[PDB]
Amino acid sequence: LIVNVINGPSHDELVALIEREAAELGLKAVVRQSDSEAQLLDWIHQAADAAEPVILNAGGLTHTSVALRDACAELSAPLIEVHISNVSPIATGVIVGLGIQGYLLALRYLAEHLG
Numbered sequence: 001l002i003v004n005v006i007n008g009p010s011h012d013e014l015v016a017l018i019e020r021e022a023a024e025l026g027l028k029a030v031v032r033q034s035d036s037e038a039q040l041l042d043w044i045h046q047a048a049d050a051a052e053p054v055i056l057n058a059g060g061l062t063h064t065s066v067a068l069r070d071a072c073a074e075l076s077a078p079l080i081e082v083h084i085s086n087v088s089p090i091a092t093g094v095i096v097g098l099g100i101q102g103y104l105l106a107l108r109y110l111a112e113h114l115g
Contacts, residue, residue: 003110004047005031005103008040008058014100021104025111037061041071048074055106056091057082078113080106 005018015031022029034040040058047054048071056079061068069088072079078092086097093109095102 001028001114002050002052003027003029003055003107004043004052005029005055006040006043006057007033008037008056008061009035010059014103017100018103018107021107025107027107027111029107037065037068041067044068044071045074048076051076053077053079053110055080055082055103055110057084057103059083062088077115078110080109082106 003022011033018029018031032043034043040061044054054072054075054077056072058068062081069090072088072090075090079090081089081091081094082102083094083096084099084102093106095106098105
């Protein structure tokens with residue numbers, strides 16, 4: 001049901017695509033853009049506590065942030081990492097270089113893999 005879709009620090013049109021696709025795939029996507037690491041974590045925790053899956057796009061943090069990795073290690077559901085362009089890992093899966101479609105394809109995986 002509830003899929004968190006989160007972006008780290010670095011749009012309106014897109015948020016509708018993911019939202020519409022989730023509705024159409026029988027999910028409910030909460031798409032949120034963070035402006036600081038402290039709330040990125042705030043939001044990963046909320047997701048762990050609620051046992052919710054996460055589609056994450058945060059580059060740079062992926063390679064160094066123990067806090068972020070320890071937050072992600074708390075999840076009871078898949079963590080899919082998405083990267084819009086080509087150029088841890090706790091990530092259950094990774095999609096990179098497939099454009100904005102990566103977000104949608106990650107929704108498609110979550111829709112056929114729900115527990």
